[PDB]
Amino acid sequence: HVGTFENITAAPADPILGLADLFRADERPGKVDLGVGVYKDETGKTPVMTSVKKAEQYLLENETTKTYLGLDGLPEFGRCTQELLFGKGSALINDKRARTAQTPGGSGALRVAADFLAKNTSVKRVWVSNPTWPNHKAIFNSAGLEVREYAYYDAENHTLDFDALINSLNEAQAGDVVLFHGCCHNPTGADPTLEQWQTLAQLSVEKGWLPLIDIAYQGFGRGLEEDAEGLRAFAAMHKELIVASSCSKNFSLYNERVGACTLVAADSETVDRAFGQMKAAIRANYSNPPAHGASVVATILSNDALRAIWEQELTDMRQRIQRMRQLFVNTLQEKGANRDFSFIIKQNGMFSFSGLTKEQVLRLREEFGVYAVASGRINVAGMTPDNMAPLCEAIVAVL
Amino acid sequence: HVGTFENITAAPADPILGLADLFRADERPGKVDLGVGVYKDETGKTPVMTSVKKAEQYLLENETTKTYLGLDGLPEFGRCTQELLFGKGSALINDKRARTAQTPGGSGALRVAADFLAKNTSVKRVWVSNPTWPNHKAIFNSAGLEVREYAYYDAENHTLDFDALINSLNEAQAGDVVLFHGCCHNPTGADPTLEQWQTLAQLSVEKGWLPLIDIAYQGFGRGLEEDAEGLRAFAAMHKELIVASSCSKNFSLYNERVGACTLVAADSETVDRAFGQMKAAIRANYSNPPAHGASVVATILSNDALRAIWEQELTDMRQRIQRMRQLFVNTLQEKGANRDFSFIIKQNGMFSFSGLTKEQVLRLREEFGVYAVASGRINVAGMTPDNMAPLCEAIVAVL
């Protein structure tokens, strides 16, 4: 009997990995890593937040059991997530129109949402932005959902081509899902404005598709509250919603897998009914969500002192990012970049498309030991006041 | 436009949640919980293990980042897992034929295996024992895999009906999956003997199906190495295996979601092709596994002093279960039970089928505040020296 695994065809090599091998094997001093997918401080590190440490000490000292919680995870985390997302006093919360399941990251939430949709609804297709987060397609496809792209980023001109977005979405029908990045679009950093969000909200009500809000960077853009404005415009308008939230980035809890899938429906009865089917989706997957990270978040958010410390820590991260964006533009100018990079200061979060070609990226690695990804995505958190000059000089030189 | 969530049909009520809810509402002081699915100590609690508290203190003091690890999680965890499962200095490990992905629980490991199989192999059908752990069917069905049942437990006579097992498995073809519980079969507690495992192993070789060992109770049965004997009997023989292991129970880390999916192929190169595809299944799901629990386990297993502390508390738990099995059997006789229950002491782990009807289970609950699952499954860890008398008096009353 031939093996079950015998004829499996190797998965394509992960370029996210090939590049990271190169970098580690590169012995040149002053190599610059703009390819990384996480936040890094001015020293090139991704530390545990102080607020997070304090909470972990609190859990060490006080937790008395690791016994399972329900499939929807820690209730307090569900409440905190909801208030962060919709704002305290939200009519969604008061009207009990929203149910939240803690999940293993925003990723888990996306997959839970997809399994739930494919299994219980007529949804057959999900619209995502071009470009979008690389993992979106595979998550939805795996649940049997087709993924379509809508127009978003004008790459030659470094803009959110809003007119093209709108027009391309006319092909989306009632009953499709349309996925929108809550804030700090990944990888472009180009976000709708408040009014564009309001327009999008209004169109979704008119067209009848289901919005899904992927919000993984709340607090990395303009501020905690400001970064949710777009979601809340959707909440005021469309009576059904799915939100996949994440604490990986805004709590630097990446590997603890802290996120949430929130269903919103027209009334309590409908959302509760939907939610029982969501539990079934979770039960058929990994069942209970991991407690540690979520308890950390709930401990922090439930406590005023701890909450203050976390918000300042998050603000610091947000402001360093904005500082590097500004410095990048100014230093390219100073070093004589033969074109304008001002778009960089109009974008939010860690990631922008540098607008470099794959040839330029190649040369930047080989010749200057500056590492970006093939798409030209750069992570501005990879920048520091100390590596900026040689970084920008390298870029100027390949233009 | 009509909602997308409007016509979702309600999920069936969850009997496990339902029982848990009824028990919580029961204000009767002598109520007894033999329904829960977790270990409990002589005081009725499910404490965090001393070894785990120590390892969590260590992580608190040492950890300096929470950045993503690979899709297979923490390498030390994978190594400790493989050694626990196959034996240090295993030819499997030596030949580099095994690859381990840390997963969110054995549940996550079962789902990952299922998606992996559906997407990359000719596998259409998974065979499980009647009876089995309740979530098996949901998990494999969600991946589009048909679940079929094979013969296992003789309920009237309280035995593993091994001739029934073998004959019903004749229906299982090459490239089917057949799932076995490694040890402490849930819910019967009736395990194959070594020679039965060897026979089973020889049969799967002859017929050509793919063995999946769900092993969640290593160390709860006869001891760590003894409970792994069945798995090693399969490993010694079959060129391919899948193992879905869990630490929820043997470390009392239930809600941290610590487990693994281990693939085993004929050679390194082949298991590598298989495992990369598995990584793609994980990437389409929750991506990275949750760190905290796997780190705790890696820290404990990798330190001689902590491991000994862990093995001790686990021995305490295994031994407490066996004592309750014995005391239960003995107190039933002394209270006048109208039939013999000595099959109980022969069976392994927290769970046995009591043989009580749903009529009896029901009366037990309502009249005596004694909770068991409708199938009559009982959790002996729900027993103590203090509650044993009222408990056995209740059972005798409904016999």
Task: Please report, for residues A202, A254, A321, the alpha-carbon distance to residue A352 in angstroms, rounded to integers and kept in the order given.
Answer: 28, 20, 11
Asked if residue A298 and residue A281 are part of one domain, the reply reads yes
Asked if residue A117 and residue A237 are part of one domain, the reply reads yes
B7 is a domain residue:
no
Alpha carbon distance A129, A134 (integer Å): 11
Asked if residue A218 and residue A129 are part of one domain, the reply reads yes
Query: What single-letter amino acid sits at A261?
Result: C
- What method was applied to determine this entry? X-ray
A27 is a domain residue:
yes
Disruptive mutation site among B9, B66, B103, B296 for chain A (greatest number of A CBs within 10 Å): B66
Asked if residue B353 and residue B339 are part of one domain, the reply reads yes
Q: Which chain B residue lies closest to A106 (C-alpha atoms)?
A: B286
B72 is a domain residue:
yes
A82 is a domain residue:
yes
Whether B107 and chain A come into contact, CB under 8 Å, resolves to yes
**Coil, strand, or helix at residue B130?**
strand
The domain boundary residue, chosen from B280, B300, B318: B318
Alpha carbon distance B398, B385 (integer Å): 21
Asked if residue B250 and residue B220 are part of one domain, the reply reads yes
Using alpha carbons, select from B149, B134, B103 the residue that is nearest to residue B260: B103
A47 upstream amide cis, omega within 30 of 0: no
Query: What single-letter amino acid sits at A156?
Result: E
Q: Is B16 exposed, middle or buried (0-12, 13-18, 19+ CB in 10 A)?
A: middle
- CB spacing of B46 vs A66 below 8 angstroms: yes
Q: Which chain A residue lies closest to B272 (C-alpha atoms)?
A: A10
Is residue B99 within a helix (H) or strand (E), and if so which, with residue range?
A: strand B98-103
Which residues pair with residue A126 across a beta bridge?
A147, A177
- CB spacing of A4 vs B104 below 8 angstroms: no
Strands (E), B286-379: 351-353, 370-371, 377-379
Asked if residue B375 and residue B304 are part of one domain, the reply reads no
Q: How many domains does chain A have?
A: 2
A375 is a domain residue:
yes
Look-up of token digits 């390949």? A398
Asked if residue A296 and residue A386 are part of one domain, the reply reads no
Contact (Cβ atoms closer than 8 angstroms) between residue B324 and residue B383 = yes
Q: Is B144 annotated as a binding residue?
A: no
Residues in chain B, overall count: 399
Alpha carbon distance A163, A152 (integer Å): 9
Using alpha carbons, select from A233, A347, A237, A246 the residue that is nearest to residue A289: A246
Asked if residue A220 and residue A144 are part of one domain, the reply reads yes
- CB spacing of A6 vs B266 below 8 angstroms: yes
Residue A118 maps to which CATH number?
A: 3.40.640.10
B1 is a domain residue:
no
DSSP 8-state class, residue B58: H
A5 is a domain residue:
no
The domain boundary residue, chosen from B276, B303, B318: B318
Alpha carbon distance B85, B78 (integer Å): 10
Q: Which chain A residue lies closest to B56 (C-alpha atoms)?
A: A60
Residues in chain A, overall count: 399
Resolution in units of Å: 2.2
Q: Which residues constitute the domain of residue A349?
A: 14-47+319-399
Binding-face residues of B in 193-222 toward A, CB within 8 A: 207-208, 210
Label each residue of chain A as H, E or C: CCCCCCCCCCCCCCHHHHHHHHHHHCCCCCCEECCCCCCCCCCCCCCCCHHHHHHHHHHHHHCCECCCCCCCCCHHHHHHHHHHHHCCCCHHHHCCCEEEEEEEHHHHHHHHHHHHHHHHCCCCEEEEEECCCCCHHHHHHHCCCEEEEEECEECCCCEECHHHHHHHHHHCCCCCEEEEECCCCCCCCCCCCHHHHHHHHHHHHHHCCEEEEEECCCCCCCCHHHHCHHHHHHHHHCCCEEEEEECCCCCCCHHHCEEEEEEECCCHHHHHHHHHHHHHHHHCCCCCCCHHHHHHHHHHHHCHHHHHHHHHHHHHHHHHHHHHHHHHHHHHHHCCCCCCCHHHHHCCCCEEECCCCHHHHHHHHHHHCEECCCCCEEEHHHCCCCCHHHHHHHHHHHC
Asked if residue B327 and residue B207 are part of one domain, the reply reads no
The domain boundary residue, chosen from A295, A318, A341: A318
Asked if residue B340 and residue B211 are part of one domain, the reply reads no
Alpha carbon distance B341, B331 (integer Å): 10
Residue B373 maps to which CATH number?
A: 3.90.1150.10
Whether B38 and chain A come into contact, CB under 8 Å, resolves to yes
Using alpha carbons, select from B239, B259, B241 the residue that is nearest to residue B249: B259
Binding-face residues of B in 259-278 toward A, CB within 8 A: 263, 265-266, 270-274, 276-277
Decide if B133 is catalytic.
yes
Whether A123 and chain B come into contact, CB under 8 Å, resolves to yes
Query: Which of A10, A111, A287 has the CB atom closest to B107's CB atom?
Result: A287
Q: Is A377 annotated as a binding residue?
A: yes
Asked if residue B399 and residue B365 are part of one domain, the reply reads yes
Alpha carbon distance A117, A122 (integer Å): 8
What own/partner pairs with CB < 8 Å and gap ≥ 24 does B42-46 have? B42/B320, B42/B384, B42/B385, B43/B384, B44/B384, B45/A64, B45/A65, B46/A65, B46/A66, B46/A67, B46/B252, B46/B254
Task: Please report, for residues A46, B115, B182, B246, the alpha-carbon distance to residue B101 in angstroms, rounded to integers and kept in the order given.
Answer: 24, 14, 18, 12
Asked if residue B393 and residue B276 are part of one domain, the reply reads no
B3 is a domain residue:
no
